[PDB]
Symmetry: D2
Subunit: 275 residues, 4 copies
């Protein structure tokens, strides 16, 4: 289930993110700082999407290769690369299809990458269908398996500890998706027995115009995520490295202490493989 196969979400992703520059303005300093601090040059983006963060890293002189399971989303990143094909940096940008579940065979890590990134609440898309989080563990394993020792892994997820609690996803401004075009997002929590099983969001993004004066137009699409509670993900992700890692998490790219006033919309996990 690509969940993006229909292509409606991809078509308007640009409208969903809003000003990519304005979005990337946040955490660019941190991501870049972190990357450089650990002398990272080879970066693998497993959540490429339309290329938002891959493009940023490419421009910033990193050697990036981006993968994604949806060729509908990737098709836009590719489009961008071609458009800037005359730029040496972009001439060396690698964009290929791949799936976390089969990453190991999709992207030959070989020596591995200096850093791996999964941003914008991409991982939560993986379902627990098997009953046990086996799929979660496997995918989380392969992704970590792409990290060269001493390398970095930056994987995030929406704050579901809050969505599950209030039953609603935070509205408006978002560090990853900030666009006045997104008119509505309806949260749908499904709890099997007494455990949260799935959070389904239904977006309503206004396609610029979609009608002459007096008639506005919108695009509607739905995405489903597994609500990973912070504590659980921390445990899950660390386990993916068999413990040989240094773990840490930030609020919205800012330090995070449980009980703090500010409630983050996303939780960024920073893991540094050790051996």
């Amino acid at each position: 289930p690509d969940q993006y196969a229909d292509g409606e979400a991809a078509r308007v992703w640009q409208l969903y993110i809003g000003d990519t520059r304005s979005r990337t303005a946040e955490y660019k300093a941190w991501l870049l700082g972190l990357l450089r601090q650990h002398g990272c040059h080879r970066v693998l983006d497993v959540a490429c999407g339309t290329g938002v963060d891959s493009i940023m890293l490419v421009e910033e002189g990193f050697s990036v290769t981006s993968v994604d399971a949806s060729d509908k989303m990737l098709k836009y990143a590719l489009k961008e690369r071609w458009n800037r094909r005359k730029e040496p940096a972009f001439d060396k940008w690698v964009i290929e299809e791949a799936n976390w579940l089969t990453l190991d065979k999709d992207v030959p890590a070989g020596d591995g990458f200096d850093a791996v990134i999964c941003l914008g609440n991409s991982f939560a898309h993986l379902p627990d269908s098997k009953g046990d989080q086996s799929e979660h563990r496997l995918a989380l394993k392969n992704i970590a398996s792409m990290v060269r020792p001493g390398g970095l892994l930056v994987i995030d997820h929406r704050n579901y500890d809050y969505i599950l609690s209030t039953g609603c996803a935070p509205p408006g401004k978002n560090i990853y998706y900030k666009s006045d075009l997104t008119k509505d997002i309806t949260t749908s929590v499904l709890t099997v027995n007494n455990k949260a099983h799935m959070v389904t969001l239904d977006y309503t993004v206004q396609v610029p115009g979609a009608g002459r004066d007096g008639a506005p137009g919108f695009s509607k699409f739905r995405l489903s995520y597994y609500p990973h509670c912070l504590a659980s993900f921390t445990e899950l992700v660390q386990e993916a490295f068999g413990g040989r890692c240094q773990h840490s998490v930030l609020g919205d790219f800012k330090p995070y202490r449980p009980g703090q006033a500010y409630v983050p919309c996303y939780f960024i996990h920073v893991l540094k493989k050790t051996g």
Copy 2:
């Protein structure tokens, strides 16, 4: 959406109810008592199902006509009637297809019935698709419209105030469905925005045998209900009589006071129309 069209549920309903006699043993005293107390002879069963309670009322000398929207379920009640066709009582039992939504035209009440019954958590099946409980109000209206003034309406529903609260449906023994054959029931609560929208139960009933020594067999089916909170249903049902009624509700056919120790699995609403 018959929800019973597939016929899997009907096929094993008998296994789900278990010992009908043992089930009917409960409340038979009360239902009969209540019926007689109000001199009721003409009884309409809008939730006929396989005929459990209609059959009981027939045997008890009442003049009953049973309707139901699922011809898959009704098909078993009919089967029963034929088998006992030699019994005068059963020779006068009426079984026809009908839908609460169109009852008014499906069952010509005319003068009306002395009593109407909807038992076994049948009504909760009606969805709120329209956004507003309009369908609920309409169906609840037609059903009440079949009650002769001074007549009775006995409509029940699972205690969803508890299911919604614990996220799980009560396990094991049940006054309506008590069978050791039912191995599992998985509750699935769906809350759109922050309001409970639907409760989906997934039953696992062991079909006797379904395999030689060493191999047991089961049947799996799913049913979805609108979680009507007590307070809301009391208001809804009373409104269906335009207020010309006498309302009351019992726990599991026993007096019910909010805050009482015993937590009822079902809530039985007893309404007596006045004119």
Copy 3:
């Protein structure tokens, strides 16, 4: 694939057949004569449908048991039986669900029946999905397996030698379905590679009224048949008896000689199982 599961066809079958009495008027003399001529008293109807011919045989003093795979169609025959439950003849009419494919286990022939009937182009419904006519052979075998030695089997089918040739099904009057209510029947022939694989008919039967003065209403349903060419069926059906049978075929219940002027709409096969 019940093909009748949706119930649209059953709901208006009555309208499709038209005047059952006028329909049964044809071949009633022949069927009855044939039956009596071979001293048949126990008759099994494997294509019961709504009960048209079973009812006729019941009224005529035969001891009939009718089976059918569609409970949507059977549900009407049952309805009829109940309505005439006070008639001794109908009190002894047996109606049950069964499938040619599993007839042997569905209907315990035991000694077997004096005659078996499959009329109204019922058998052609069986598809050749398996690639080989295995299903046809098996079903045709079980059906024959219900015939007591010296017994009779009356199985028919539309004249597909003609439908395949003209690509269109004969219009209007029909010995089995004669109703001015049927406004249209669109034939759809599907030939895989160069062999006829399936004939799909789309019926348009006008439901009486379905609208006030000025607005008429119709019902639309589709049925699919395997186009059995005469020669092939003769071979197939005889083989079902392992050759221990006396075969013959009539046009529309009249003698049939290939090349004759009159083009039959149906082909009636009469087989007499022999030692």
Copy 4:
């Protein structure tokens, strides 16, 4: 209905065509000759597919822009362009998504192209759903509307006059698809009433290997075409130019005279707009 959306056909198209060089060897001389003879430099390919003929034209120094409705097929042409991005010719190759039905707005012809090509039996994919060949006429209109006056249009189609007649598509060698990997092609002709409505082909292409020694593997996909009889297409296509055109048709890129011994697998229509 992309008909290619699933992507199974695109994934193995390469295997279906076989040796593109060997395929393109045929008619390359003619296509090129014809193009040059009319001094054509700007070529639009509306059936781009994986880029087979567009690539050939690009290499041959033409200025080509390719469009196609399936992004699953186009995605491969794009892949090819990128790989040869260092070749000036390919740096100027334009590849975009478009649909014959909306071509006029998808590809701004403006002045128009010197030549337009639709090869490999692409057009026959367009269905007649509307009842009337309106869609055929519209699409055929837009495509022609891309031809600059004095320009050329090369549109082909399988010889359905033969497929319809023999009920089977020609086997083996094919000028457009010649690969020993294609193990089977099952034709399926659907005739509504007495008119041929659709021809559905089911391909079985062996994916190289798909299993170790002893186990071979295949890929199965289906495509549906409208069987355009020669005479009809000639009329249809000419009408698309409002008669201001010079029409002609060849067998398999060789002169064609009705009744000739050789039976072409495809019919290539060559139109030269005058207006």
